[PDB]
Enzyme design. Sequence first.
Site, PDB file in Angstrom:
ATOM      1  N   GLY A  23      -3.745   9.073 -15.666  1.00 23.40           N
ATOM      2  CA  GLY A  23      -2.896   8.005 -16.228  1.00 23.40           C
ATOM      3  C   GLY A  23      -3.346   6.641 -15.730  1.00 23.40           C
ATOM      4  O   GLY A  23      -4.565   6.360 -15.768  1.00 23.40           O
ATOM      5  N   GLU A  91       2.507   1.418  -1.547  1.00 28.70           N
ATOM      6  CA  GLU A  91       2.081   0.105  -1.006  1.00 28.70           C
ATOM      7  C   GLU A  91       0.880  -0.415  -1.804  1.00 28.70           C
ATOM      8  O   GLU A  91       0.112   0.380  -2.337  1.00 28.70           O
ATOM      9  CB  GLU A  91       1.728   0.231   0.457  1.00 28.70           C
ATOM     10  N   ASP A 139     -11.271  15.460  -2.942  1.00 25.86           N
ATOM     11  CA  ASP A 139     -12.000  14.478  -3.778  1.00 25.86           C
ATOM     12  C   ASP A 139     -12.356  13.224  -2.979  1.00 25.86           C
ATOM     13  O   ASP A 139     -12.180  12.119  -3.485  1.00 25.86           O
ATOM     14  CB  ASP A 139     -11.243  14.174  -5.083  1.00 25.86           C
TER      15      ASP A 139
HETATM   16  N1  LIG Z   1      -2.616   8.376  -4.662  1.00 26.85           N
HETATM   17  C1  LIG Z   1      -3.207   7.398  -5.357  1.00 26.85           C
HETATM   18  C2  LIG Z   1      -3.016   6.039  -5.024  1.00 26.85           C
HETATM   19  C3  LIG Z   1      -3.673   5.060  -5.783  1.00 26.85           C
HETATM   20  C4  LIG Z   1      -3.537   3.604  -5.450  1.00 26.85           C
HETATM   21  C5  LIG Z   1      -2.518   3.145  -4.560  1.00 26.85           C
HETATM   22  C6  LIG Z   1      -2.389   1.819  -4.169  1.00 26.85           C
HETATM   23  C7  LIG Z   1      -3.326   0.960  -4.700  1.00 26.85           C
HETATM   24  O1  LIG Z   1      -3.378  -0.393  -4.516  1.00 26.85           O
HETATM   25  C8  LIG Z   1      -4.443  -0.841  -5.272  1.00 26.85           C
HETATM   26  C9  LIG Z   1      -5.040   0.145  -5.935  1.00 26.85           C
HETATM   27  C10 LIG Z   1      -4.349   1.355  -5.565  1.00 26.85           C
HETATM   28  C11 LIG Z   1      -4.439   2.681  -5.963  1.00 26.85           C
HETATM   29  C12 LIG Z   1      -4.487   5.500  -6.848  1.00 26.85           C
HETATM   30  C13 LIG Z   1      -4.590   6.876  -7.165  1.00 26.85           C
HETATM   31  N2  LIG Z   1      -5.420   7.346  -8.181  1.00 26.85           N
HETATM   32  N3  LIG Z   1      -3.974   7.789  -6.390  1.00 26.85           N
HETATM   33 CL   LIG Z   2     -11.650  17.603  -7.870  1.00 24.11          CL
END
Ligand SMILES: Nc1cc(-c2ccc3occc3c2)cc(N)n1
Ligand SMILES: [Cl-]
EC number: 2.7.11.23
Length: 330
Positions: A23, A91, A139
Amino acid sequence: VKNGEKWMDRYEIDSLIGKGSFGQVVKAYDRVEQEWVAIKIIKNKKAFLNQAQIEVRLLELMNKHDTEMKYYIVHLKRHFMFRNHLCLVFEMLSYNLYDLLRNTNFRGVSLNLTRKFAQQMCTALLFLATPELSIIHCDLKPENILLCNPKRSAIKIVDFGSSCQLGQRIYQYIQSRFYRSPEVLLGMPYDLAIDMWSLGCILVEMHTGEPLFSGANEVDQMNKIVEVLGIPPAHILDQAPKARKFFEKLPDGTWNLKKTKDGYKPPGTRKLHNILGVETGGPGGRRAGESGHTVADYLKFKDLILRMLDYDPKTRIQPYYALQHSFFKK
Ligand SMILES: Nc1cc(-c2ccc3occc3c2)cc(N)n1
Ligand SMILES: [Cl-]
Ligand SMILES: [Cl-]
């Protein structure tokens, strides 16, 4: 989703930070806490919802453990369902270590900055290894490690979308290919040691600017690992479902590369010693004479990396012992 959109008299959406398989991540203002946040908005499809539910469970499991070591993982503030999308509120962090490498024109950061990243990442892996957690990230790669602040070298790991507790494995095909462990390439049941393999790969790349093992596919990946580390040990290959994707067993119980048409260096001859430029002024000789980049500093780094890239997940260095390595001693 659109700038200026207001959710639930609470969040005001500003802009798109990032898009994932899962997403999208948006910058939003939280009127209650009076702070900016990152909202990870999961697609409204069963597959992505169910995997994100596991991500939420693992992040909440980490939050209930108040220890020093938890603060190298991105903080989940909360989650809610909105217009049939699961929404994770984090955050705000800054840019990722791939962007950092791109900004050096892929020439790498100093051994001193590499050391600082290594020490934080080893501390994160030690936290995830807490028995009651036993979380495999699955990952780890530069894109999934973010600076806390564009001025500083503090980092946090993000994206627990592929993550699983030990003994809660779902998929056999996991990790980004460049950072994939031999045990996953070989179709074996994996444990937390796959993250330490990824980390070894990451730290070399952070310093040289280039991926250590950039396979175009699994066969190319395993060939590039073998160029640096030689044929994997027989005791591993003897137990590997996919050993014969890459290798062939000889009459005398010995293994060799399956060869395809050429158009690779002989096994174990692309020495990490030369990749790091230990005795030749660092990667591409670009660190010649810089302080913090002596042969002795290089040999300690080389030693820690080769322990992280043990073929045997049993004997591969674990986070606590990596933190005691001489590379981290003043
Ligand atoms: N768990 C997680 C956190 C982020 C995440 C959290 C805080 C952030 O601030 C700036 C970019 C960002 C991405 C992205 C994904 N794909 N998965
Ligand atoms: Cl994976
Ligand atoms: Cl990359």
